[PDB]
Amino acid sequence: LDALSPEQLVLTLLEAEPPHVLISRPSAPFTEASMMMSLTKLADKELVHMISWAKKIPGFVELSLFDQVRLLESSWMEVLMMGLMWRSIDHPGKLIFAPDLVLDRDEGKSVEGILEIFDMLLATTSRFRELKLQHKEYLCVKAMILLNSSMSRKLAHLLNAVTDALVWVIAKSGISSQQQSMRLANLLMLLSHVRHASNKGMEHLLNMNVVPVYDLLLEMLNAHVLR
Amino acid sequence: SPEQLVLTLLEAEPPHVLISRPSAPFTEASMMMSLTKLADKELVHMISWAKKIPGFVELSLFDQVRLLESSWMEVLMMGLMWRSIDHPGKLIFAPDLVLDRDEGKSVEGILEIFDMLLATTSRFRELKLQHKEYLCVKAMILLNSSMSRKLAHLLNAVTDALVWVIAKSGISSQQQSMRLANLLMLLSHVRHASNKGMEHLLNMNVVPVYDLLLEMLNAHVLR
Numbered sequence: 001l002d003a004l005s006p007e008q009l010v011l012t013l014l015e016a017e018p019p020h021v022l023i024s025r026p027s028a029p030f031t032e033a034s035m036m037m038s039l040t041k042l043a044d045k046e047l048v049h050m051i052s053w054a055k056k057i058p059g060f061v062e063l064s065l066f067d068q069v070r071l072l073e074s075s076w077m078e079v080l081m082m083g084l085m086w087r088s089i090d091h092p093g094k095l096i097f098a099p100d101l102v103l104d105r106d107e108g109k110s111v112e113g114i115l116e117i118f119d120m121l122l123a124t125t126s127r128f129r130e131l132k133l134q135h136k137e138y139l140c141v142k143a144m145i146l147l148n149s150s151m152s153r154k155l156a157h158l159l160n161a162v163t164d165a166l167v168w169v170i171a172k173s174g175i176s177s178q179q180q181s182m183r184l185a186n187l188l189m190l191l192s193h194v195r196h197a198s199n200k201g202m203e204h205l206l207n208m209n210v211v212p213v214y215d216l217l218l219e220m221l222n223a224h225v226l227r
Numbered sequence: 228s229p230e231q232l233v234l235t236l237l238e239a240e241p242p243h244v245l246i247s248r249p250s251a252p253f254t255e256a257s258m259m260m261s262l263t264k265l266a267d268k269e270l271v272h273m274i275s276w277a278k279k280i281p282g283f284v285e286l287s288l289f290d291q292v293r294l295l296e297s298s299w300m301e302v303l304m305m306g307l308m309w310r311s312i313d314h315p316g317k318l319i320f321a322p323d324l325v326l327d328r329d330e331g332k333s334v335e336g337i338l339e340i341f342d343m344l345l346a347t348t349s350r351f352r353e354l355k356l357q358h359k360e361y362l363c364v365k366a367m368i369l370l371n372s373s374m375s376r377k378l379a380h381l382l383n384a385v386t387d388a389l390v391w392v393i394a395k396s397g398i399s400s401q402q403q404s405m406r407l408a409n410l411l412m413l414l415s416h417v418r419h420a421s422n423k424g425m426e427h428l429l430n431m432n433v434v435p436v437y438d439l440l441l442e443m444l445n446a447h448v449l450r
C-alpha cells in the first residue's frame with residue numbers, strides 16, 4: 001500500500017530512470033538513410049532500456065505478462081517522444097536525441113516527411129516549457145503514459161496511484177487550489193498531443209506484413225486462455 | 228464565468244441528425260454511405276455550434292478553421308460516445324441508425340475502430356460522465372486540437388468551467404482531482420480513435436503545402 005504512496009512512488013520513479021543513451025552523427029552530411037539509421041539504432045537501445053524501467057515501477061511486475069507486453073507495445077513511441085521532449089525542454093528549437101545528436105528543425109529535412117513530426121515534438125516541448133514542467137511531474141506523466149496506454153483491479157489501481165502521486169507533487173508547490181486543478185488539467189491535456197505525435201510518428205515509420213490476429217485474440221480472451 | 232459558459236454550451240448544442248438504414252442488407256458501400264451522409268450533416272451543424280462558443284468568433288478566421296479542421300473527427304466521436312453511453316455494446320449514430328459491434332463487419336476494418344469507441348464509451352459510462360461534464364469536454368476537444376492570447380484564454384475558461392462542474396458534486400477534493408485526471412486521460416483515447424478513423428477513412432492527392440504555410444506565417448501574410 002505504502003510502496004505505492006505519493007512520496008514512495010515518486011522516490012521509486014526518481015531512481016528508475018533509464019540510463020542515457022549515447023550516439024554520434026556519421027561521417028558524410030545526413031541523408032534520409034543515415035538519419036533514420038542513427039535514430040533507429042538510438043530508438044532500439046532506449047527500448048531495451050524502457051523494459052527495465054517499466055519493471056521498476058511499483059507493481060508493474062505483478063500485472064499479467066500479457067498486460068505488461070500490451071501496455072509497452074501500445075505506448076512505446078509516446079514514452080520515447082516524452083523522454084525526448086523532456087530533455088529538449090530547455091533548448092527551444094532543438095531536439096536532443098543524444099549529447100552528440102542535437103538536431104534542430106531544418107536538419108530533419110534529411111528524412112522526407114519527418115519535418116511535420118519534428119514540429120509537433122518541438123511545439124509540445126514548448127508547451128511543457130511554458131508550464132515549467134518539473135522533473136517530478138515529468139516522472140509521473142511518463143509512467144501514466146505507460147499505464148494509460150490501453151483500455152482491471154490491479155491496472156486501474158496502479159494507474160490511480162501514479163495519478164495520486166502527480167496531484168501530490170503539484171500540491172507541494174504551494175499554488176492555490178484552483179491553480180492546482182488548472183495545472184493538472186493543462187498537463188494532462190498535453191497527453192492528447194503526445195499520443196497524436198506518436199500516432200503520426202508510427203504512421204510515418206510504418207511507411208518506411210503479418211497475419212491479422214485481432215479477432216483471434218478476442219476469441220482467446222473470451223475463452224480465457226490468453227497468458 | 229463557469230455557470231455562464233455551461234449555460235451557453237448547453238443551449239449551443241447541435242440538433243440531432245436523423246438518418247435511416249437502407250433497404251437490402253448493409254454492404255461495405257451502403258454502410259459507409261450512411262455514416263458519411265450522417266457525418267457531413269453533423270459537420271455542417273458543428274460549424275454553427277463552434278460559432279456559439281463564447282469567444283470563438285473572435286479568433287482569427289484562420290484559427291477557427293484550423294481548430295475545426297484538426298478536431299472534427301474527435302468532436303464527432305465524442306458526440307457519438309455520449310449518446311451511446313446508456314446503450315452498452317451499441318453505437319447510437321442516430322435514433323434510426325443504431326449498430327451493434329458485429330454489424331460493423333459490413334465495412335472491412337472499422338471493427339477495431341468500433342471497439343475503440345465502445346470501450347471509451349464504456350470508460351465514460353463507468354465514470355458516470357455527466358451531461359455538463361460532457362459539454363465542457365467537447366469544446367475542450369475542439370479548443371485543444373492544435374498546437375495564443377485569446378486561444379489559451381478561451382481554452383482555460385472551459386477548463387475552469389469543467390473543474391467547476393466537478394465541484395458541485397460534493398465529493399472530497401482528492402476525488403475531484405481524481406475525476407478531472409480520469410476524464411482528461413480519456414482524451415488521449417478519443418484523439419487516438421480519431422487518428423485511427425482518419426487512417427481508415429483515408430484508405431477508402433494534392434500538393435504538399437506544409438512548408439509554404441510556414442513561410443506564409445513567417446512572412447506574416449496568412450489570413
Ligand SMILES: CC/C(=C(\c1ccc(O)cc1)c1ccc(OCCN(C)C)cc1)c1ccccc1
Pocket residue numbers: 039040042043044046047080081083084097111114117118121201202204205
Ligand atoms: C520522432 C523521431 C523518431 C524516433 C525517436 C524518438 C525519440 C527517441 O528518444 C529516439 C528515437 C524513432 C526512430 C525509429 C524508430 O524505429 C525503431 C524500430 N524498432 C522498434 C524495431 C522509433 C522511433 C522518428 C519516428 C518516426 C519516423 C522518423 C523518426
Ligand SMILES: CC/C(=C(\c1ccc(O)cc1)c1ccc(OCCN(C)C)cc1)c1ccccc1
Pocket residue numbers: 047048050051065068069070072073076
Ligand atoms: C516493438 C514494440 C514492443 C513489443 C512487441 C512487439 C511485437 C508484438 O507483436 C507484440 C509486442 C514488446 C513489449 C513487451 C515485451 O515484454 C516482455 C515481457 N516482460 C517481462 C517485459 C516484449 C516485446 C516493445 C519493445 C521494447 C519496449 C517497448 C515496447
Ligand SMILES: CC/C(=C(\c1ccc(O)cc1)c1ccc(OCCN(C)C)cc1)c1ccccc1
Pocket residue numbers: 262263265266267269303304306307320337340344424425427428
Ligand atoms: C466511427 C465511425 C465513422 C464515422 C462517424 C462518427 C461519428 C458520427 O456521429 C457519424 C459518423 C465517419 C464516417 C465518414 C466520415 O467521412 C465523411 C467525409 N467527409 C469529410 C466529407 C467521417 C466519420 C467512421 C470513421 C472512419 C472509417 C469508417 C467509419
Ligand SMILES: CC/C(=C(\c1ccc(O)cc1)c1ccc(OCCN(C)C)cc1)c1ccccc1
Pocket residue numbers: 270271273274288291292293295296299
Ligand atoms: C473537413 C474539415 C473542415 C474544414 C477544412 C477542410 C480543408 C482544409 O484545407 C481546411 C479546413 C473547415 C473548417 C472550418 C470552416 O469554417 C469556415 C469559417 N467560419 C465561418 C467558421 C470551413 C471548413 C470541417 C468542416 C465542417 C466541420 C468541421 C471541420
